[PDB]
Amino acid sequence: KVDEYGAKDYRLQMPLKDDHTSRPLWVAPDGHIFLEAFSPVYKYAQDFLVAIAEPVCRPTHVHEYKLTAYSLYAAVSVGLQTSDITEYLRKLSKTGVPDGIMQFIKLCTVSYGKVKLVLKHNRYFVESCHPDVIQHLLQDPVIRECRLRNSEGEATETVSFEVKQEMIEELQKRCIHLEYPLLAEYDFRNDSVNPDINIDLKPTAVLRPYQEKSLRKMFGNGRARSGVIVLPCGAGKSLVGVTAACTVRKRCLVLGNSAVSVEQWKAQFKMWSTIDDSQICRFTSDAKDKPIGCSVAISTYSMLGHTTKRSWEAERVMEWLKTQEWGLMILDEVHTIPAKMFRRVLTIVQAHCKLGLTATLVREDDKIVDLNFLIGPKLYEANWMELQNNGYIAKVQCAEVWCPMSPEFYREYVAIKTKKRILLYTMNPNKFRACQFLIKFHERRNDKIIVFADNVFALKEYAIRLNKPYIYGPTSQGERMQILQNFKHNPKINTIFISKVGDTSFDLPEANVLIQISSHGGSRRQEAQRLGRVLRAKKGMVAEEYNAFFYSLVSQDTQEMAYSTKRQRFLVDQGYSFKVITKLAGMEEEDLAFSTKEEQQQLLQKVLAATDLD
Amino acid sequence: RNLQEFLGGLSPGVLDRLYGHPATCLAVFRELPSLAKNWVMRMLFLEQPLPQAAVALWVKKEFSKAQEESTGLLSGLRIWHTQLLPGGLQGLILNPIFRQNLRIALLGGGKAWSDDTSQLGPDKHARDVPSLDKYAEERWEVVLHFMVGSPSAAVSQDLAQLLSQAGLMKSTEPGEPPCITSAGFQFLLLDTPAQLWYFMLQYLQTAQSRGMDLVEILSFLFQLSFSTLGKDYSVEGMSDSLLNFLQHLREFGLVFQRKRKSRRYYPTRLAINLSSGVSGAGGTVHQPGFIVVETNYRLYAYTESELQIALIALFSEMLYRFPNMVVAQVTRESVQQAIASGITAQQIIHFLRTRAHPVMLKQTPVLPPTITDQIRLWELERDRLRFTEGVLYNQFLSQVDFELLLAHARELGVLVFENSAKRLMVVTPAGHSDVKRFWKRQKHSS
Amino acid sequence: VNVLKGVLIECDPAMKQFLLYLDESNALGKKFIIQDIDDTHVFVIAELVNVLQERVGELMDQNAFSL
């Protein structure tokens, strides 16, 4: 029922009881859950909600969580039944639990844990304790095609049956249609085909309480379960992956975006794991290692997904990987997995336990529903604000600086209606002056400055005029490393211009000032992950609530305003504040470029000279 | 508008008649500045006029402006008056009626306004102070719900006639409930003491319409101001106009009365602070804040009365309606709609600050500064386009003629905008005729 | 003298350039922006200023996001 104001009239379906203050939860019949942080039982309520409910928004006071079938399956896999969950919900809900949600929970939980998929002898078997369900699912035409059949076309005969590897991902989606999702259960201790590996945990590795909780939730009843864990950048996600690999003790596969990710993972493994270097191999296009005796293999998705003809040695390595059975597989940056080529890598690679790690999961193409079965349900997601309070990460000071558009640019901005319009607002002389003043202020404050600009031309022009190093497409790796080392070590240079390649193509050195000038066009998750990766915790300013500085230069009255508003929605859902700054104090006293309007006319001439080709 | 501003604009006769009430004199003295209070106390027993120079020599030279402010306030209120002192001096002497009533109130004597209502003995149906306060709250809640138009609030027609005369709600179509205007929205967004003060000011501005004596009503209000909360008084001894005004106040909830024939009446705290207007009652213990504002522009209300729900929905998009909770979101569209309805940004900010939840009170800022700044920016967006009709003069051949015409226009005060560099100017359409005639006459004299 | 009767509009130079673009490109249709007087002031006939305000509001609506 909907009121005239648009509010959903849930009063009738929610019988309120007199235990208002003690119970902190509101359970609307639509599936949403509201929690008050100031309640004394917030910690218990937070722990209960995280286990069973997927959070939507976590601002300072009231948090909103959502109930999903995948979340219910994850809760069942943890070991919680319907009765205890219902009891805890009723003990915490201010109003009575609607029967619609109750029936929703009853239907999902009963159907969970019925169908099991086993990978043995490089063969996939579907088996269950209820042959009636198996017999019923045989009638499905999609399941008939996915089921492996004999060389003569005859179908193969807790009875299990072989399933085609190429149709595994198809079967995963069909399970949703049949309402019988598969079970990602692995024999953590009962495994015998794959021997253990001489790899342990160094004493220098310390697991933070949330990391330990996430690992223990993943290891349901002592058995590793496939899933996805979301952690903020810089929170030792690589350390968590190394710890999980050491715990598994089986064959380990790790996939990164580029060779830099492979090198970072190898360094972390050497830093925390006890596996010998001879058992660590890099299947990269430049630095190659023999796959013989490769206990842990680190590679990239595109290397395994190279549809074009590969090198002869790479073909041999791929054959060995296909022949080899992998107890554990590790995937980094899950948000790029929904791509079809990278999804095909999952079919190509035969692995028992698959764990995915990333910082964000809100794809702009919303291709995450299928991702819930490509790997599994989201195992854990840490609260950014809570970790900021714990001091594990820097408490970032975020600000959006509005740079007025010059009237000459503004008229041309309105005149242009095609994609060439990006250059006009990305090259605002007023924005240039604001960026120059910010750089001067932070250099006088002795701060590390990273200027991110997606547009190659704008980034190059800004870096050249400001006389700072610039990083763009080619960026020869030797020169890139030299620039990174100069930024890390040389105090004279503390301002680095980085193009779009700064997201995942290489490692971002720890800094404190990050200024974003150019936008992708609405990448609400990509730039958020970039911001998380750029800024890390800095000692000395732990007591202050503003130890990391992020500024977003946005052109007023332009489409960049809408892009920024759409993008910052994800960070606002995390409780991150954003202050709008229209006037910058100190620009009047400081001397900046383009002080005269004729200089801005020259910049306009230069920008117009850069046609739509750039 | 404060109480003294309305009092200062009254005719001398009304002020003289009000001076006959010692309670009125007490209220006036209490409303005076401290320097004015000292001056009045000095002149309480002075039967001789005081030379202006002697009065002026009392205060410091630096505080002359404050001294002049107090002198002007006293002169405007007609508390004192100037007399042609012998020898050409201009002495200052207090109003004999005002001074006599002040002495009666302070030193004693005279006659009590109320005839000791204890004659009737204890009240069989007496209430308690919390009950009186709750009833006062309920009546104003009914009035506000009726202003909203909810059928649950049914009030007297003449009460709606007062609102129509006040202009808050205009009866565009008779028979149907009147549509509340932008002024009504601004009145609703005001705090309850401010709403009561504005309503009473509007009633006073149209007091002569009902044939009610302004002097009697003001004196009765002043007497109620000093009345004791939880104590009844005698209805008897008042004119029929005063009885009707008391019944109106009872309808407002300011005065409690079980029956229209009852001889007792209990003034409420709202009526006590009514005379002071908006100030004076700095320690108002209002309802605890039930509104929680989150960084995602979300509002959570721990309220169930439809009045607050409607007030929140005036400038926000409702999302969920729980039995003990209301969840809405602050959106640019809703804010712009409220602005088009006449709602200003400051009223929303002040209202939200008033309803601030105790949890949010722990923070050093009462409300998130980013949200307030965003609301201010949304408000500033609406008035980006400045519309000013006028007549443009742009055909000036001589700079001297343009300067002369600009000087004449500024003398007339009809100038809208000037551009001396290009010899262009804008004048008001009403003043265009005068400037056109002056320009033609200048050519005629040439 | 030949003087026109209309409404004076005061806005920032960005809005002035937007109005000049609208008048020149004839997006508003007939050229109701007869003459400009100052770097921030324009003189518009009141017959079209109401529609012009709608066009300006459309511009700022596009430079925003719908929640």
Binding site: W402, P404, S406, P407, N430, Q556, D557, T582, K583, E588, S595, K597 | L377, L380, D383, R384 | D12, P13, A14, D39
Partner: peptide, 14 residues
């Protein structure tokens, strides 16, 4: 500097 420093968010704030 007059145009840039005080174009949109000054003619109402100041």
């Amino acid at each position: 500097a007059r145009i840039l420093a005080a174009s949109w968010p000054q003619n109402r704030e100041d």
